[PDB]
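User: My advisor asked me to double-check a structure prediction for neuraminidase before group meeting. I don't want to rely on an old file, so could you generate it fresh from this sequence?
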Amino acid sequence: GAMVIEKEDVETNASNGQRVDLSSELDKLKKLENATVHMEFKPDAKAPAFYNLFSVSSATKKDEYFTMAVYNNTATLEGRGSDGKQFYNNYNDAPLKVKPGQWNSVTFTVEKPTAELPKGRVRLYVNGVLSRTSLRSGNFIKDMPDVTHVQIGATKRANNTVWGSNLQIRNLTVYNRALTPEEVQKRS
Ligand SMILES: CC(=O)N[C@H]1[C@H]([C@H](O)[C@H](O)CO)O[C@@](O[C@H]2[C@@H](O)[C@@H](CO)O[C@@H](O[C@H]3[C@H](O)[C@@H](O)[C@@H](O)O[C@@H]3CO)[C@@H]2O)(C(=O)O)C[C@@H]1O
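Assistant: Sure, here is a fresh prediction for neuraminidase from the sequence you gave:
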């Protein structure tokens, strides 16, 4: 199939700086045009207001990163390139929330522009259910020339580290194609 990264049974906690480093996998992510990032995780129950699930970030450019995050329980998403400009529409007020202290999944899909999808297509799903589609761009890691780091949890942006929380992660899976809504429903 299309599985390029699979990480199972890991966690963010005090002893690892609330972070699982996956930066060894950066080149795999840079190569992707259509992609899926899927994470099944359990946040500690009284979560921070903003925390990162999966991010790619840069040691030299503080405002160039990709993040699938949770903001006041809302599953959210943001990508910014080397000019700091937004790749996607705002997801901070997307409709679907996770429940902390319980198992949840969040799935992002990205489809590069095509003749019929002229600006590409991005989707975020929460527990198998489409939360919001964004048709601003189909930009992703290939569009971020200065990235250096990949992580679950606390995210290094230049000389600062932010968005840490304690998470149990049953799996992180990255695919080299965009799963369909039907596939997200069954494969989560
Ligand atoms: C998806 C999203 O909301 N991204 C925005 C983020 C996050 O809201 C934030 O990192 C979550 O904590 O915020 C961004 O803007 C931050 C940035 O401008 C820095 C500059 O130092 O300031 C942050 O606010 C500070 C505040 O100024 C501090 O004095 C103190 O109050 O804490 C906060 C830290 O949140 C901005 O939130 C970002 O780049 O991180 C803009 C993103 O679009």
